[PDB]
Design a binder for this molecule. Structure first.
Ligand code: UPG
Ligand code: UPG
Ligand code: DA8
Ligand code: DA8
Ligand code: MN
Ligand code: MN
Lengths: 278, 278
């Protein structure tokens, strides 16, 4: 939110008011948050805006036990596709610091290995609060069993975002696998819900991510004290939070896809961040 | 930007990802700002969000010389349609305080008469900076020769907005009546421009409106010192500013229409704020 200097002169195609970018999908939520699909953004304009703020993006990823095997491909493909041209700080949380692969990084990019012993929400909020506030402007929190195949850039950045789960974007809300037991803090009735957000890709400003992760951690602790575990764990709580605190952007399933499970439907022009067999 | 409490439970239609709200118009800019049309927003969700922040909206209007005649209809229709349910502070700038009509206001709404002797941008920035920062969260700056016919509410609120001029929303950029002389600070080349914004309806947070009005006032003073007056005066400068500082929402021409001049085209589902004969 600091003073924003003027954009330079730029030559690009004029947006046309009577020509939608995309007619096949919803590109704005009913609370006026953009839903990010290919064709909705001019990345040159966005890159200018975010570079003029010297934006730094933190990316958190957990690689515990056997999941350290996923780091090499995750990080090497992140170097090809994630926020290229911007300042990036990777935070790799692991129980095996020596198993973190030595990955060559582009300029302006750094990696920190954070040793650790549910945990994700606690670890993001409780332990790293002060560090993240000092070091980055935005946090992006993702699963490790993944690879980048195409551009994932500043179009995602906003105070708070979630990602449409690739298995549920066409589903009606009654079919969503929200927690349905009223005894859980994650409870959502059958007549509520905007979207089903996937636990493996959310983010926002540091402040908003710390709010989300704190709230989810607190709600998970209440459930534990009451002897209940939400059906989809942290994802159930994330869904409850984003129902009650609307995200300021929503990422389309371009941003979290499983090609082996779901193919490559017409509505996806790009597959950006995709599941690796586990 | 203060801590946002949770929304309550709400029952409303599920947004459907594979059903666009509107297929006939562009509903998001290439820099991911919503373009506000009827059908794109659920006003119940937005009202909740903004009431939970106890939002106060300031509305500035100038009524100098014969234009004091427009105040009664302007204000009486604003009471019917502008931010109803929210805190509103009208700021009426006039050379004839005694000619301001006595208009009955709903609860939580107030009106201040500010006596005055180009001026609008200066008067909004220079003279009223401290007052607005203390009194309101957002400023909305409009022409007085107008009436409200339908809802104008919190869907417009955002850090910085402009409104699509009703005569130019279908025009290509070369046809826009931007200032075209390189000697003016408002100069825009024929290969630049997103939209033609109308000078009679802009706004944003107090901070962003003070930035815009300060910059436009400064640019107008430079032009005056150089012996040039932009083709459309403050509107030319507003257009230059919004080209270089992209608005975070854009209002459709629903929000500034002239029915006598332009009728009621199919693309307009509502005529919200409309020209009165002058
Ligand atoms: O032994 C493990 C298990 C998990 N993880 C981490 O936790 C993530 C999530 O586990 P994963 O096995 O990838 O589960 P998924 O079924 O892909 O997870 C989905 O469902 C989970 C809820 O059950 C959410 O926590 C996830 O974010 C959501 O993407 C992994 O990517 C790792 O980052 C480890 O590091 N080691
Ligand atoms: O004698 C006057 C003249 C103007 N105004 C104020 O200035 C506004 C703009 O003048 P108007 O006569 O309404 O001009 P328009 O042609 O409707 O204005 C368009 O074009 C102007 C640039 O020429 C911009 O300043 C306007 O905001 C834009 O709406 C009026 O609504 C009043 O608020 C007065 O109060 N008294
Ligand atoms: C065979 C696996 C079928 C999984 C289909 C639905 O995806 C699952 O949805 C759950 C919520 O209902 C939860 O988010 C886990 C999620 O499964 C993960 O994501 C899928 C897209 C696959 O990549 C799967 O392997 C992975 O476990
Ligand atoms: C007869 C008047 C024709 C005006 C058509 C175009 O509107 C004018 O556009 C100018 C920029 O090119 C500038 O914004 C003034 C604007 O005219 C105002 O707005 C129109 C929509 C009408 O309401 C008009 O009466 C008013 O002066
Ligand atoms: Mn996973
Ligand atoms: Mn006018």
């Amino acid at each position: 939110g600091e003073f924003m200097v003027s954009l330079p002169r730029m030559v690009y195609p004029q947006p046309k008011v009577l020509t939608p970018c995309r007619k096949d999908v919803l590109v704005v939520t009913p609370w006026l948050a953009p839903i990010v699909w290919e064709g909705t953004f001019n990345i040159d304009i966005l890159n200018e805006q975010f570079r003029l703020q010297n934006t730094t993006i933190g990316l958190t990823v957990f690689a515990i036990k056997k999941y350290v095997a996923f780091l090499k491909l995750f990080l090497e493909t992140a170097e090809k596709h994630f926020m290229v041209g911007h300042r990036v700080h990777y935070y790799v949380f692991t129980d095996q610091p020596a198993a973190v692969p030595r990955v060559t990084l582009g300029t302006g990019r750094q990696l920190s290995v954070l040793e650790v012993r549910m945990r994700r929400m606690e670890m993001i909020s409780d332990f790293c609060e002060r560090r993240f506030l000092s070091e980055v402007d935005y946090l992006v929190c993702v699963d490790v069993d993944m690879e980048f195949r195409d551009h994932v850039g500043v179009e995602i950045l906003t105070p708070l975002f979630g990602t449409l789960h690739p298995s549920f974007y066409g589903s009606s809300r009654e079919a969503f696998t929200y927690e349905r037991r009223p005894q859980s803090q994650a409870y959502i009735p059958k007549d509520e819900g905007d979207f089903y957000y996937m636990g493996g890709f959310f983010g926002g400003s540091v402040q908003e991510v710390q709010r989300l992760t704190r709230a989810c951690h607190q709600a998970m602790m209440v459930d534990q004290a009451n002897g209940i575990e939400a059906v989809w764990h942290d994802e159930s709580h994330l869904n409850k939070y984003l129902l009650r605190h609307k995200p300021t952007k929503v990422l389309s399933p371009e941003y979290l896809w499983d090609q082996q499970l779901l193919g490559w439907p017409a509505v996806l022009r790009k597959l950006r961040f995709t599941a690796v067999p586990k």
